[PDB]
Symmetry: D2
Subunit: 463 residues, 4 copies
Amino acid sequence: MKKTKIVCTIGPKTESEEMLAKMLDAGMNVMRLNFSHGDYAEHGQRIQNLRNVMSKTGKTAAILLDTKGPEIRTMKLEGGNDVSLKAGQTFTFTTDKSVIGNSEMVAVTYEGFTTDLSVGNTVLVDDGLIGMEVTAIEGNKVICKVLNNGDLGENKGVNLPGVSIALPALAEKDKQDLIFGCEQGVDFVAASFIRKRSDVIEIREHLKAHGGENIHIISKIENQEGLNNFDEILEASDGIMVARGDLGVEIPVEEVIFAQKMMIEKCIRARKVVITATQMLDSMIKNPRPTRAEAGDVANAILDGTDAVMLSGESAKGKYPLEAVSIMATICERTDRVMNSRLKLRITEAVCRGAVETAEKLDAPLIVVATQGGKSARAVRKYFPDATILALTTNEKTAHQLVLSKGVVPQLVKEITSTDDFYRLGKELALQSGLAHKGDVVVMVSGALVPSGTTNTASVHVL
Amino acid sequence: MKKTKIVCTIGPKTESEEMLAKMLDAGMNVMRLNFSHGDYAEHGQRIQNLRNVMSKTGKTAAILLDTKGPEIRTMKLEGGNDVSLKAGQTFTFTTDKSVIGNSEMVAVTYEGFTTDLSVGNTVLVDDGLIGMEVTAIEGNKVICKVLNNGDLGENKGVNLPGVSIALPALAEKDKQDLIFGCEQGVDFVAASFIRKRSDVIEIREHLKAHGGENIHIISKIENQEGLNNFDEILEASDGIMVARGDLGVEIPVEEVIFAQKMMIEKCIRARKVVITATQMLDSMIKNPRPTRAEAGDVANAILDGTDAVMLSGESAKGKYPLEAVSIMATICERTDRVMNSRLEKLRITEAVCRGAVETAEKLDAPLIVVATQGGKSARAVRKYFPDATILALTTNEKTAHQLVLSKGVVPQLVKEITSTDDFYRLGKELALQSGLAHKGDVVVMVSGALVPSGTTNTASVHVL
Amino acid sequence: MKKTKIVCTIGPKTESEEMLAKMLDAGMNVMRLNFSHGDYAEHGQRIQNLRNVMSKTGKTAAILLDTKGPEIRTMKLEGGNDVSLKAGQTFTFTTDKSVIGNSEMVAVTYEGFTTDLSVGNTVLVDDGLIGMEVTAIEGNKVICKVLNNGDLGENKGVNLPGVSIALPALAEKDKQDLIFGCEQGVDFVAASFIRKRSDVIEIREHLKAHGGENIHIISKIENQEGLNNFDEILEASDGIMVARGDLGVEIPVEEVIFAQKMMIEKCIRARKVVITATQMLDSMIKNPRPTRAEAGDVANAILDGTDAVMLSGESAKGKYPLEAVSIMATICERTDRVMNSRLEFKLRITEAVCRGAVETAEKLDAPLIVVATQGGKSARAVRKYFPDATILALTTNEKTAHQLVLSKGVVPQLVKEITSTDDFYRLGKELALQSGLAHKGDVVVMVSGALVPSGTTNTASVHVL
Amino acid sequence: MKKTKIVCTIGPKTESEEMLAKMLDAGMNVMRLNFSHGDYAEHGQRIQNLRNVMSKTGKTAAILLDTKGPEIRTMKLEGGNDVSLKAGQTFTFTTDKSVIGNSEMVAVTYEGFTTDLSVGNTVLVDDGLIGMEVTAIEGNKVICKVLNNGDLGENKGVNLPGVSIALPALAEKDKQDLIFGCEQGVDFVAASFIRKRSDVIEIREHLKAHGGENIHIISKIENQEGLNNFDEILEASDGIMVARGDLGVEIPVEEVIFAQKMMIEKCIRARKVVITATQMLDSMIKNPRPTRAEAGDVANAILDGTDAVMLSGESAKGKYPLEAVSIMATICERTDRVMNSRLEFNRKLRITEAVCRGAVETAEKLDAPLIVVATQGGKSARAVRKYFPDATILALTTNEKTAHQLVLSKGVVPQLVKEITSTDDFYRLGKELALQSGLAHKGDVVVMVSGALVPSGTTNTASVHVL
């Protein structure tokens, strides 16, 4: 009876129908396809396997495509050997991709490394392992002074704290991956390294161009620029993914937690899904139990008010995926049990808030919602109702998409002819769902005599 | 645009169709038929006239039948001449008509004055003018001691606080009047001499016996016993009439105010209509303008939260009825203008209606449209004193008439309401058509869906 | 056990020490001296009598001087007989006093009757008995049309609804009446027919000139102009008296109670005393019992949140004064019994501390709030929030001790001196026990001003008796 | 601008006065002396050094003594070499010390290991590295089945989840350490492995017996039994230390989070100090920067409402003590910056509660940047602190111990005064010191809280002043 949802990164070890079924049973709600690794055949087969399991078992789940995204990385070294960098030495970055790199200098993939950077800026290498301060920028070169000792290797990630990185919204591979996403008919697209509105709009147009207009865009906030432009990004997006690990490398350490809480809170207010990802249960990639701190982080993330929590590497390429999903689910359950509701504003707001409040007054274990796009369910969900949300819809895509929202059980129905019919059918399905029984009060929310996008009716019934 | 309703007692001076129309224009909402004096031809004609005015103008109104009830009075004295009494002496009451007695002893009209009464009880005469306490009970006589000086007159009213008089709520005249009421198909019956729940039940039974089961009973609280059993009387009744003047004769002046307020509050809580009736604008029976104290009293009575106010004598046999109704209406509007909403085992109806008013208030909705069969939903919404006017759609004419007595509700008779969506459509149409709301205004729409009649469970917000 | 205070107009039947004692026992708190009637010897004797009763019994009370004020009256008629006026006729008012007046015309005392009035204005005579509409104004005459039939007599009051009457704030006798008041050392001055702030300023300035600077001025709102300019009058005044009867003839009838309610509300907020006065229990002048409506009126006036209620004629020249005071006290008690506190959600320190004091007192079930005051401000500041607890006011100022008698739910106590805050707590606790209003074990909240002059209240302390 | 206090475990890296001074500048408020290691001369030297720094700089600080406590540990192995235990094997624990231990069996130091433990119970070894399931208990032996592969070594700690361990409240060394604590006149004593009220009482009596009655006892909750008896333990104690690391091996992991939050909450209500300890910034033992997760953990611990946060190892034997204290202080400042007041809104509460709540409320209402408090024992300051006032608490006291001890309470600045003769005197002196502190300025509103005409333990008067 947990409400917060679980996104599971599926890989070679958990792609089989058996494992997927066990994963769904364990508490999995959404399959993440990390396009940082794999080819189309694999991902396609995972999709097919999952949906067949879904078809066979009658279990519900969503499919999310996570792009690799554009990134600045170092390149090849002399003889393929790592080098050791010392503190205080003159290190240089060149934008020439033909350059093989040694101690003194290395090449980067980004053609704007010289342009975007300024003298005094910080350059981090290999997930913040090695830090450098730019001393000079000349021609195609960026001359820096090393701040700390460390060993540089091949193809390491580069982070530029507080720097606006003129990279495209989509790498060329990402564009093709999105087309694949449209072909497969995924429910979500998690766009990596979103820094501004134009990026999201570009994602949207790219989708639109290949019949993916109904696919929801989850903007991944990974650095300061994206955090600064969070409002427009959120307004333009259908959801947000809080990437703590990257933020930990991009912004001051003491600020990440408030970025998470702030983004979660704003996501909650906007009735849009939010996912807290990375650095979740990483220790369980090799161990059968997570550490206390991890459980704490996850629990607190749930208490912040997250729609979903994500497993990355634990469930994909880890030695104990089911254990991770299981303990994650227990944490979810334990945390959800003790959370309470949070009670010019418009119709939808007043009606949904009033519906939750009314539900709370009458000890209703269920709030049934008639939805076409999924907006009403999220509108009711906004207030963290004690009641489970039974979202009845004739749209599979939204039915799938609602799987990601907290505390909502979506259900596909043939048709809803009217409001009274919705009440009848809703009562029937409310009893059929097993979430409520005879004698229980149920609150029923819908849009009457209005187009989609407005919630204005609330009705109380006894089962 | 007043919310509080005005009940007007109609008499020969105000029975005409033109005058009734003028009275309706002035602010009249309900016609009171005081059967304390008059015949069936008059009242019937009054009813017919009102209904004619209603038919021609398209104006809505209710008809209230007020029973006279039984009374204990003193009897005949020497030569039809006045007399005089003394304090501290031995006054005696006998259950014997033939006995005449100016002082020392007196006869009463009620057979069993000796029987029901007990030693220690108080006997009041002429609206509490003279009080005495029962000293002993023997045979056909009961000796009492006078507590205060006063002059006794011919055939004066008698009050017995806390004493069960054991007379029925209805005499043969009241019974026939009530049957007449059922025949005429009146909307309300204001029952006199209600002391306890059984009295109300008897009225109900008499009604039901003549096809008046849907007629609402307004119980008149006019005595101490009725005040003690107010809860049961209220539970059994459809509404209450607060008779301050009559209570003033049975209880201390210091308790009447809070008795009124308490009865009004409890009536409001129970979704039962309440009427403040006696000593309203009595001076306007003789004068064209009321006194400050009266207007103040009325205003405070409205502020207490009464559904309606009654003119009794001002509108019936007074020289300035139209003026009284007018100034009453101005007072009503003026008082209603500055009143705020009053938000609140808790059930559905309560939660939905309260939530509906709250939602209406939050969104600046000028109208709350309500679907009603029995009228309970409109009254349930009214309970919270909505700033918005209640537009009550019903297929029941009786309730449509009866809702005229409830505060801030405009009843509307419709042919049919087939469903909830149909109710929303028709409600929007009539909301616009009524002129109380226009394009752009939000309206909250309240009804019962897939539930019995007496239950309200749906609230929906729409834009016109 | 009542909180609402009772002002009683004293006359020949209640002028004796015995009756005054009885009146105090019945529930009287303040003596009103209506200088519309009486001479200086009489009023002086009343004052002396009250002070004697107070000295002998040891009970506390206040003395209020009510001025007559300026008046517009009609004058004498032919043969000293009333005349009967008919509606629609031509009645004229003349400024020539020497004129004896008949049906057609009568003289008035005010020489600006033509100036202040305009065509269309209403002229009322004898407490709204006779109404007239101004048709024309010529020379020293005001030509009017009678609206209703009535008998006009000699020396009748004239009322002008909604008309600004350019009469002075003080009549010639009133100055000497106030001087007498200062000499006698009265506690309050009730000024009649206050229409504007300047009037209050004039009274205050006059009192200031004769050692009456410490006397509180209560402005009587009796007409449209005074009501329209109520805020400035309240700001300028120390208190207000709501004259319903006088307002009732001056403003629309449906507006009188909301004027009362509005004015009472503002007085409490301003921490100034308010008195609900005229048309209280007048029926008890001839009858031994009040009417229901009157009792209702008193109760509602108290429920509005008035500090005190006034008897005018009931207590002076009525057949049943003691009965009136008694039933008044009973009504006060019955109404006060069911009133609760008003704990908001401008305001400053004093407000915050006093509000907090009441809050804490009620939170801890304290039946008593002891307050140290020099001017009486802290007690009224605490009183503003209608504490369930009785307010015990300690003072080294006799005048404030007298004046606090009018404030609701305040028991004044004259103390020798208050040397410090701890000393105040000690003395307050002691006197709290001595008062008998509190007992051993009871919690008491103690409010005072620490390290600040006598105009701000900043300390609140909780003690157990 | 931070209100949350920082407890720093001092070691070889931070034992000098210079380092102590820098540590105080960095944000250190309390020195923790971990008696799991060291001798009296060393700790004494540490105390002397801190007190010297305090004497020279005029800075205030507290000294907290952390006991090693009793423990169940394994004993010696063959040749001093690790042995490898495999999953599914029959392992045995013996109460015979003289036994040197191999792959099959090892001895434990605790004699009631046989008695307290039962069949089915779990046995964890070496900080939960190796887990075993008890299959049978015979004689002096406890037969168990190993659940996971692992290497067992010499002198490793043993944890018994959910087991009531009849160990004494105080080890023999702890007692002499406490006597030393009394000798040195420490401000706090952190008692290890508290499971029940009696344990607290024993320590209290032991202190009392050696003139340490004014020393505050912080009960360290490290297992389920202590968590079960938390209320009475808190009742008997002056404060609590939430040992998350120890809890993580003793109770279900998903329960640890709410145990921390629950205990912080109850400590706040009880007007007693609470310290969130262990697994704070451990990564900084090796690195110059903490992990995001660590900062998050600390921040949330502060947001839960802990009075203080504790460094253990970061400040003692780490390569980056200053960095750890500094970033810790930064976290404290950043987190404290955005916290709001928590005003009550359990049926009946008394005077002190009403006065203090009302004082904070009034303080907030008038935008008072400072609340001055008169205290003898520190209860009033802690009583005011309960509501997390935005205003700083300036605590005036004639008690040196209380001045020192209040350094641990959140958002309170203690000040030692010679005398307070009366309430007006307190207002005068308080206003003076309020101005002198630089925490308030001319014109600013100050709320002044104290006990007037009442014994110690009672706060009953609150007064508003303009400086």
